Amino acid sequence: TLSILVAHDLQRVIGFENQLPWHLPNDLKNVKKLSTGHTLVMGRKTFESIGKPLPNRRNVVLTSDTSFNVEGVDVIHSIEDIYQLPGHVFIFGGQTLYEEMIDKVDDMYITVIEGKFRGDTFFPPYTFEDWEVASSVEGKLDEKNTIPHTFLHLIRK
Ligand SMILES: NC(=O)c1ccc[n+]([C@@H]2O[C@H](COP(=O)([O-])OP(=O)(O)OC[C@H]3O[C@@H](n4cnc5c(N)ncnc54)[C@H](OP(=O)(O)O)[C@@H]3O)[C@@H](O)[C@H]2O)c1
Ligand SMILES: CCc1nc(N)nc(N)c1C#CCc1cc(-c2ccc(C(=O)O)cc2)ccc1OC
């Protein structure tokens, strides 16, 4: 399976100055749940902002940099390389990866952040005419998660 994994706000903002615009532990928890034991594919900028591979899953980084060789990370240099990765592969961002892959993935796990943040990077526009809502779950708010959010699983029609 090839899946997109993303959190975007009401205007499809996904990032600002190479960081997430919001603080949402429940979403990080869900990312961990979804991707542990599987594969994350991310663009070079997204990887550098995280700064190290995420534990207990395969980390794959797409870059044109022939010098890229980071411990605990597998490097690929072409979009086509993604299709050779075994198992459940999650496209983990950032904007360039989402734009390059949104027309190819099987399904999308999207956390809709119900706010309007300042952003400089975006998830591409999409229509629910193309995607079935397999599930939609309101995130629980608390002291540490204070922005309303909804977990979607969308499957291509
Ligand atoms: N909200 C979310 O769910 C989420 C998730 C992930 C990321 N983000 C955000 O997304 C933003 C970053 O997105 P971005 O578009 O600026 O960068 P990005 O997609 O993370 O990385 C871009 C880089 O990926 C490499 N790349 C992409 N396509 C390639 C291809 N076909 N062949 C070879 N290399 C390729 C290139 O690296 P080289 O220049 O090294 O060749 C390119 O410069 C950040 O703000 C981050 O916080 C948000
Ligand atoms: C966790 C935010 C997020 N949510 C969803 N639903 N899908 C995604 N693809 C990403 C993402 C991402 C990239 C990213 C992750 C992290 C990050 C932070 C904490 C944890 C963790 O505690 O597990 C994991 C990833 C940090 C920066 C960063 O880019 C700036």
Task: Give residue limits of the domains in the chain.
Answer: 1-157
What SS3 class is residue 79?
Answer: helix
Q: Is the CB of 27 under 6 A from ligand 2?
A: yes
- Homologous superfamily of domain range 1-157: Dihydrofolate Reductase, subunit A (3.40.430.10)
* 17 annotated to bind ligand: yes
Burial 19-47 (b: 16+ CB within 10 A, else e): ebbbebebbeebbeebbeebbbbbbbbbb
| CA of residue 28 to ligand 2 center, whole Å | 6
Residue 98 near residue 91 (C-beta atoms within 8 A):
yes
Three-state secondary structure call for residue 67: coil
Pairwise CA distance, residues 63 & 41, whole Å: 11
Cα–chain center distance at 25 = 15
CA of 45 to the centre of ligand 2 (A): 13
Output phi, psi for 52, to 5 deg.
Answer: -160, 160
Distance CA 63, CA 79 (A): 10
Give every CB contact of residue 38 below 8 A, 6+ residues apart in sequence: 57, 58, 87, 88, 89, 90
* Solved using: X-ray
Token pair of 150, please? 């909804």
Q: How far apart are CA 53 and CA 142, in angstroms?
A: 29
Q: Give 94: exposed, middle or buried? Use CB within 10 Å, 0-12, 13-18, 19+.
A: buried
Cis peptide bond N-terminal to 94, omega within 30: yes
- Rounded to whole angstroms, how far apart are CA atoms 122 and 99? 9
Strand locations in the chain (E): 2-9, 13-15, 39-43, 58-62, 74-76, 89-91, 107-113, 121-122, 131-138, 149-156
User: In sequence order, what are the beta bridge partners of 110?
Assistant: 6, 152
How far, in Å, CA of 110 to CA of 98, rounded? 12
Torsion over CA: 92, 93, 97, 99 (sign):
positive
Question: Resolution reached, in Å?
Answer: 1.9
